[PDB]
Every structure is written in structure tokens, then in C-alpha cells.
């Protein structure tokens, strides 16, 4: 225990030496983004209860959403139509995911099972291809590496990597003290980051199964995590009501986004395609569009009666989908 | 304007909408309760009609209730409890026999009652192991005054009447514990939710009837607030 304290001070001292200049000072002379105004271009209705999760498809036209109703339903964003309606066995689901190939979707809940559904089949029905079991806590996030492999973060302080065809964990990631709330895959997919209630975010190598780095700058739990499009940085959303940008290579937080007006927690975070705009969803029923480089709020998306649980920016970057507990998820452009 | 295949897709969406609405109407019939008790509570025993998350469905007087019991989760329940923020009532169970753990039960009740997400929902409190409490009080080896100093300075309310065949000091202990819980319940004073205490033995003929008439009371109060009568 004594040796760990000395090593911990070395890491903090090493980080202080590298931090020669603040990113705010580095980016003092850049054009302000200005005031951005985005009006809701759609409102997808049909969920009869609170919406917990939503994920965009790769084609950017289709998305899947999960709700307390106990049904997973896929939308056609452009035409508002419902492509599918999938009845879930368990009503409680905190996460859903869309495969990169669009062939499968995943759902995770309090039933300690991540269920993979085969959308494209003969006989014209969505059928559960597998039930992934082995976690001892609720599944907070699931993300597909490819059509075969899926990573799931759980409330048992342990993230896992599954081979869907085998159905058994091929790797397991154990470094967290609190329940894991979020998981964000990198653009290259070779590594990822996870978020937990211990107020720490850790970088895990997928193949090796080891924690490369850990970042701690949050007072409270972190609910959502999103990699920067470059893949060399990420941002985290906490109940402290501060959104912090973290750097993989530098190994220190570069900047924190906070306003005295908002003391309410952050439910979701996403990065614009260029990475300049950080869209943070809040329990105060309004998502705030943050200029990441300068950390000045440039716009507000205020059209939700209840809390925004979900936020997702399309792969093309055209549209922003925000789900919420009022059972309406609105696509903004 | 609209292609034939897109028109057929719209028809499919409309059929899906009708199926979703029918399923929601079916779901609206059932009233959903959250059963929680940390340990030694008898949560499996409180309701005998029906026998990661364990779901028990029982129906009394032509109304069907669904009861959720979760065992896996640890002491920190903040993140999964927010899912159960629409339940009609939360059934809390405590064991009055164990005085050492009773303060922990009171702290748990305070945390759940004062939870921000669960402000609206009421609580049905079952004080369990009534026969064990009576036996311990009769024996007198355990002193509630020791675990709870305030018990020595207490007077049973004259308005309340003990049931026949119950001892006076025993009833004093029962009403002391009930008042201790009800004080935490009434401290907030919001009035949107109420704690309803019930004393339950290890085996009781019908606690489902108690849950049923209590749920009638909660729905009645909600309707009175809705119509602006109260």
C-alpha cells in the first residue's frame, strides 16, 4: 500500500510537467462558432412509456430505441415509419445497440442477459439468435465490434467481450470499483473506454484485456462517455453537471465544460463529426450544444417535457436524435 | 410523391402502431408494485397468493398486481431504482424482532422515501415477525430501551386500541416502532405520498387484501388530486 502512494504521486507529478499550457490558451485565437439554432425536423411517436436507449444505424437512415414498454422498435427516420417491432421478454432495458452491418440488434436489461436479435431472416420475423449470460449485474451498455463480437459493460464492476457464435466471454476487463455506466468504442475499434460510478474512466485494449490508462477528474459518477472523432480523445458526462474532455496521449484532462446556471446531471454526451460541438443531454430537460474548443454554450435544444436519456449523432453528422422519458424522441438537424 | 412500396411500408407502420396500442392497453390494466427488503424481512413470505429480477403476479378481487423482487443488486441501489419510478406503490418490509438492524432499516426507509426519483410513489410498510417481537418483549431479556434510548420515555396513544389478547407493554413496543417509522414518513410533509404501516405475522391469512385496499386508497387520492377536489 505504501508503494502505491509513491507511484501515484509520480503519475501526478509527471502529468504536471507535461501540462505546459492550457488548451484554452492554445485555442484563444480561433473564430467563435457563434449562435447555432437547430429546430426539430421530426418527432417519432409510438413508444407508450419512457425511452431508455437509442442507437443510430451506420446508413444514418435507421435507428433502434428501447423503452419501458418492453418492446424494441426500429424506425425509418426519413419517413418516420416503423420497420420492426420486437417484443422483449423483460420490460426493463437500459441499453440497445445496432450492428455495424445492420443485420443484428442487441438489448440489455436488469435480467442480466444481453439478447441478440436476427433482423434479416427468412420467414419474415425478428427472432432472438442468442441470449448472452454470465454477468452478475445489470447491463448498462452494449456495443458491437463487428457482426460476431460484442462488448458489454455491466453493473457487476466488470466489462466483458463476447463471441456471439460461441456465446462465451472471450475476454474480461476487471479494474472498476463502482458499477459501470457507459462504454464507448474507438473509431479504430482496437480499444475502448468505459465509465463507472467510481468517477474514473479507463482505457482498455480489446485483445490484451488490460487497462492502459485511467483518468480521474469527476466528483461523482459518470453516466455517459463518447470518443472524439480523431480517436485520440474522449469526453465524459457526470451527475456533477460538468462535462470533461480527456486526452489519451497526454493522459490528463484538457478542459472541463461547466456553467453556473446548470447544477443538473448529464445523461448523455455525443461529439459532432468534426468534433467541435459537444452535445450534452441533461436531466433539466434541455440538451446543451457546447463548443468544445472554447467551452461556451452555443445553442440549446429545448423541446422535451421529461429528462433526455439518450443522445446520438449520425455517422454522416447531419442529424441529432434525442430520446427522453416522455416517450418521444426528436430528430434535430 | 409516394411510391407503392413506401405506401405499403406506411401500411405496415400503421399495423405496428395498432399492435403497440393494443399491447399498451393490455399493460395498463395491471398495477405494478416494487417489493424491497434488505434482509431477514420475509419478503418471500409477505404475500402467499403467488409462489436478475424475480416477478410475482397475484390477483385479489378481480384486480391483478405484479410484484418485482430484485436480489442481485447491492446496498447502493440508486441507479436501478430510477427504473421503478412509475410503480403504484413500493412494498417495504422490515423485521421488528431485530432491534440492532432496525436502525439500519430506518436509514434504508429514509433513503428510499427521500429518493428524488421516488418522491411521487407511496409506500406500504409491513412490519414483519410480529410473533417474534411479542415473544421477545414477553421474555424481556432484550431491552428496546438499550437499543433505542427514547423507548423509556414513551406513552402509548389512548386513542389507539390494542386487539384483544395482546399485552399492553407489547402493544407499546409495536406502536413505538410504528411511530418511529411514521415520523420519518411524515417529516417531509409534501403530501404527494403516504406511508401506510401494517403489522404482519410470519404467517398471515391475507396481506394481499391489505395491499389491495391500500392501492385503492392511493388511486383514490390520485383521482382527487386530478379533479382538483383536494
Amino acid at each position, epitope marked *: 500500500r505504501q508503494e502505491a502512494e509513491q507511484l501515484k504521486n509520480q503519475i501526478r507529478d509527471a502529468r504536471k510537467a507535461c501540462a505546459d499550457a492550457t488548451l484554452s490558451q492554445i485555442t484563444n485565437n480561433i473564430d467563435p462558432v457563434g449562435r447555432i439554432q437547430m429546430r426539430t425536423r421530426r418527432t417519432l411517436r409510438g413508444h407508450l412509456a419512457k425511452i431508455y436507449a437509442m442507437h443510430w444505424g451506420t446508413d444514418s437512415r435507421l435507428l433502434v430505441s428501447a423503452s419501458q414498454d418492453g418492446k424494441l422498435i426500429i424506425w425509418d427516420s426519413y419517413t418516420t415509419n416503423k420497420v420492426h417491432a420486437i417484443p422483449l421478454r423483460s420490460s426493463w432495458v437500459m441499453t440497445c445497440a445496432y450492428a455495424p452491418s445492420g443485420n443484428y440488434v442487441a438489448c440489455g436489461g436488469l435480467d442480466n442477459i444481453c439478447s441478440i436479435y436476427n433482423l*434479416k431472416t427468412r*420467414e419474415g420475423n425478428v427472432r432472438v439468435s442468442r441470449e448472452l449470460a454470465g454477468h452478475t449485474g445489470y447491463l448498462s451498455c452494449c456495443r458491437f465490434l463487428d457482426d460476431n463480437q460484442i462488448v458489454t459493460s455491466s453493473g457487476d464492476t466488470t466489462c466483458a467481450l463476447w463471441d456471439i457464435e460461441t456465446g462465451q466471454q472471450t475476454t474480461t476487463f476487471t479494474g472498476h470499483t463502482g458499477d459501470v455506466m457507459s462504454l464507448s468504442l474507438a473509431p479504430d475499434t482496437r480499444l475502448f473506454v468505459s465509465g463507472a460510478c467510481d468517477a474514473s474512466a479507463k482505457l482498455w485494449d480489446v485483445r490484451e484485456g488490460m487497462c492502459r490508462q485511467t483518468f480521474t477528474g469527476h466528483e461523482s459518477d459518470i453516466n455517459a462517455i463518447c470518443f472524439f472523432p480523431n480517436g485520440n480523445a474522449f469526453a465524459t458526462g457526470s451527475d456533477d453537471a460538468t462535462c470533461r474532455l480527456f486526452d489519451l496521449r497526454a493522459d490528463q484532462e484538457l478542459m472541463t465544460y461547466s456553467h453556473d446556471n446548470i447544477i443538473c446531471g448529464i445523461t448523455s454526451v455525443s461529439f459532432s463529426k468534426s468534433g467541435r460541438l459537444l452535445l450534452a443531454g441533461y436531466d433539466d430537460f434541455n440538451c446543451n450544444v457546447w463548443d468544445a474548443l472554447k467551452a461556451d454554450r452555443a445553442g440549446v435544444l429545448a423541446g422535451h417535457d421529461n429528462r433526455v436519456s439518450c443522445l446520438g449523432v449520425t455517422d454522416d453528422g447531419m442529424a441529432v436524435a434525442t430520446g427522453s422519458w416522455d416517450s418521444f424522441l426528436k430528430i434535430w438537424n | 410523391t409516394v*411510391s*407503392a*412500396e413506401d405506401k*405499403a411500408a406506411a*401500411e405496415r407502420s400503421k*399495423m405496428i402502431d395498432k399492435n403497440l396500442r393494443e399491447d399498451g392497453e393490455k399493460a395498463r390494466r395491471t398495477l405494478r408494485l416494487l417489493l424491497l427488503g434488505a434482509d431477514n424481512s420475509g419478503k418471500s413470505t409477505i404475500v402467499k397468493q403467488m409462489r436478475g429480477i424475480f416477478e410475482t403476479k397475484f390477483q385479489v378481487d378481480k384486480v391483478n398486481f405484479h410484484m418485482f423482487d430484485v436480489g442481485g443488486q447491492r446496498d447502493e441501489r440508486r441507479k436501478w431504482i430510477q427504473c421503478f419510478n412509475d410503480v403504484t406503490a413500493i412494498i417495504f418490509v422490515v423485521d421488528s424482532s431485530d432491534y440492532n438492524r432496525l436502525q439500519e432499516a430506518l436509514n434504508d426507509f429514509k433513503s428510499i422515501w427521500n429518493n428524488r426519483w421516488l418522491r411521487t410513489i407511496s409506500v406500504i410498510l409491513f412490519l414483519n415477525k410480529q410473533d417474534l417481537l411479542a415473544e421477545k418483549v414477553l421474555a424481556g431479556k432484550s431491552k428496546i430501551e438499550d437499543y433505542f434510548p427514547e423507548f423509556a420515555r414513551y406513552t402509548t396513544p389512548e386513542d389507539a386500541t390494542p386487539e384483544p389478547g395482546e399485552d399492553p407493554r407489547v402493544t407499546r413496543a409495536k406502536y413505538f416502532i410504528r411511530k418511529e417509522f411514521v415520523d420519518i414518513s411524515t417529516a417531509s410533509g409534501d403530501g404527494r405520498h403516504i406511508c401506510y404501516p401494517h403489522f404482519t405475522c410470519a404467517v398471515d391469512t391475507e396481506n394481499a387484501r391489505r395491499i389491495f385496499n391500500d392501492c385503492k386508497d392511493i388511486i383514490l387520492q390520485m383521482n382527487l388530486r386530478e379533479y382538483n377536489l383536494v
Partner: single-chain antibody
Framework: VQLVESGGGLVQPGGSRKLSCSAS????????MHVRQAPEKGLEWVAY????????YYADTVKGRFTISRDDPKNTLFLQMTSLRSEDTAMYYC??????????????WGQGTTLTVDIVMTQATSSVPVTPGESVSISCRSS???????????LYWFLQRPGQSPQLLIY???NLASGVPDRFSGSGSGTAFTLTISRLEAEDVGVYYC?????????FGAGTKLEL
């Protein structure tokens, strides 16, 4: 998945008959159902029934004399025929189809029962000689552009082997139906389309039909036969 067709046979002109196609192995409620082929001529679309029987269309040739009905719990589909005419002799096929984003309608076709008693799509050639292993191109023209404003172009390529019902090769002029080899490719311009078969082999020989789905009625081209 199977569609077995029952009923047919000789009928005196002016009589009535009812054909039944029974579905097994797939969710019959989800699939909107349909197509006849005369003994010596290409296919022609007869009727269409949506999911839940909400919408019905008939071809003008058979409108007012035919009646299409589906029994969802039994899964059977019926075509009730009245005032049978000499032109109505054909091989009647029961075809499934599902319409959502990314769907592949007309994917499966039934066996067929013999009965004895508008956008114009043209195929330039009725017959085309082929050799094994050599690229073959079949072209089908359209009177009107099949490209809708949304970007989809509704051309379908169907292949009928000898002694076999038609099967879907390409849907919407580019997308390749599942279970079909990657040799078949669909290239298409506005009002002019082509199907290219590369490295042709035996069992890829048959009549290739081009269909439009921009608007009802659905018109089939006469189709270009391949002969080795």
C-alpha cells in the same frame, strides 16, 4: 418456407373456380401476397392483397370477375374466379412480398397449378445464344423512368429455370437477393436497365423477366430466353 398451390383443372367457359395457396414455415400475416403465366407467354400480374387485407388491387383484365381473399389464422390464400374465359387459362402462382425499408419483395414463389378453359416494359431480344464461362448481358427498357424522387428505382429481375417457378435475382435494379450467387449484377440507367451475368454456368439458363414496381399494375417484360 413453402407455398403449395391446390385446385385447378378443366372448366367450361363461364364457370367458377377457386384456387388455394397454403403457406407453411413463414409468418403469413406479415407478407402481402400476390401472378399468372399463360402456357406460351410471359408472366402477368393478377391480383395483390396486403397484410391484414387492408388493400386490394386487381389487373384491369380480371377486375370485377376475380376475388382475392386471405384466411390469416389458417394461412391459406384464395382466388375466387367467376365467368371464366379462354384467355384466363394460365399457370397461377402465389407469391409472397413484404414492404419495409431494405425489404426484398417477390422473394419466394409457389409451385403453380395449371388452369385450362400502364408502364410498358420491353425486352429487346426474345432469345440470346450463350456459351459457358462467357459474359452475357440482358437489357430491359422502360416507357417511363422507374427512378422515384427518393432515389429508389423499382426494377426487378426474375429467373425461371425449366420446370421451376420464377425466383428473384435482383430487386430495385442493384440489390442482389439472398441465396443467389454473386455472378449476377444489376446495372441500370434511367429508363434503360441491364443484367450482366459473368462466368455463366449450367443451371443459370432460363427466361429472365423484368418487372416494374413504381406503380400498380405491375407489368412484366416478355423476357429474354437463354439457350446453351
Amino acid at each position: 418456407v413453402q407455398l403449395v398451390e391446390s385446385g385447378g383443372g378443366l372448366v367450361q367457359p363461364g364457370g367458377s373456380r377457386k384456387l388455394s395457396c397454403s403457406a407453411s414455415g413463414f409468418a403469413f400475416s406479415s407478407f402481402g401476397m400476390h401472378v399468372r403465366q399463360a402456357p406460351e407467354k410471359g408472366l402477368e400480374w393478377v391480383a395483390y392483397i396486403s397484410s391484414g387485407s387492408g388493400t386490394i388491387y386487381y389487373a384491369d383484365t380480371v377486375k370485377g370477375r376475380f376475388t382475392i381473399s386471405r384466411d390469416d389464422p389458417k394461412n391459406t390464400l384464395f382466388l375466387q374466379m367467376t365467368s371464366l374465359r379462354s384467355e384466363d387459362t394460365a399457370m397461377y402462382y402465389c407469391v409472397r412480398s413484404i414492404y419495409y425499408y431494405g425489404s426484398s419483395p417477390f422473394d419466394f414463389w409457389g409451385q403453380g397449378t395449371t388452369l385450362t378453359v400502364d408502364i410498358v416494359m420491353t425486352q429487346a431480344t426474345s432469345s440470346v445464344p450463350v456459351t459457358p464461362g462467357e459474359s452475357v448481358s440482358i437489357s430491359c427498357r422502360s416507357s417511363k423512368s422507374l427512378l422515384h424522387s427518393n432515389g429508389n428505382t423499382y426494377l426487378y429481375w426474375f429467373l425461371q429455370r425449366p420446370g421451376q417457378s420464377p425466383q428473384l435475382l435482383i430487386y430495385r435494379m442493384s440489390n442482389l437477393a439472398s441465396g443467389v450467387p454473386d455472378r449476377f449484377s444489376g446495372s441500370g440507367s434511367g429508363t434503360a436497365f441491364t443484367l450482366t451475368i459473368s462466368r455463366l454456368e449450367a443451371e443459370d439458363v432460363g427466361v429472365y423477366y423484368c418487372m416494374q414496381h413504381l406503380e400498380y399494375p405491375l407489368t412484366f417484360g416478355a423476357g429474354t430466353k437463354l439457350e446453351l
